């Protein structure tokens, strides 16, 4: 039984060159009137996962 990829993560992450995983920002769904425009602009951009979380979820994204 070959390993099963975690689809709930595969629908959210993407493995860039050098092996890092790209992610979006949370807190960007349906409340925006309670957030100043600065943080909204900042969270619009995409980010990358942290070192510890990367170390934790290494296995879950083995097959891209």
């Amino acid at each position: 039984p070959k390993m099963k990829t975690h689809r709930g993560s595969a629908k959210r992450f993407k493995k860039t060159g050098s092996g890092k995983l790209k992610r979006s920002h949370a807190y960007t769904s349906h409340l925006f009137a309670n957030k100043s425009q600065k943080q909204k602009r900042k969270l619009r951009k995409s980010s990358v996962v942290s070192a510890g979380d990367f170390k934790r979820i290494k296995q879950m994204l083995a097959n891209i």
């Binding site: 975690h6 709930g8 993560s9 629908k11 959210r12 992450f13 993407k14 992610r23 979006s24 920002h25 949370a26 960007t28 769904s29 996962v49 979380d53 979820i57 879950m60």
Partner: protein
């Protein structure tokens, strides 16, 4: 799992779609083309062999 603290993946949002149509082209750079002789005709079938 993260001890009931909701995992990072579920905290994060989902991204866009993927479609059946997709022309992935076998990339070959000019640096590779030097291996052929002068004045030759290079075509995908020849590249295969």
């Amino acid at each position: 799992f993260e001890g009931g603290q909701m995992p990072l993946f579920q905290r994060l949002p989902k991204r866009g779609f993927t479609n059946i149509n997709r022309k992935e082209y076998a990339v070959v750079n000019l640096d590779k083309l030097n291996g052929f002789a002068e004045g030759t005709e290079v075509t995908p079938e020849l590249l295969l062999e």
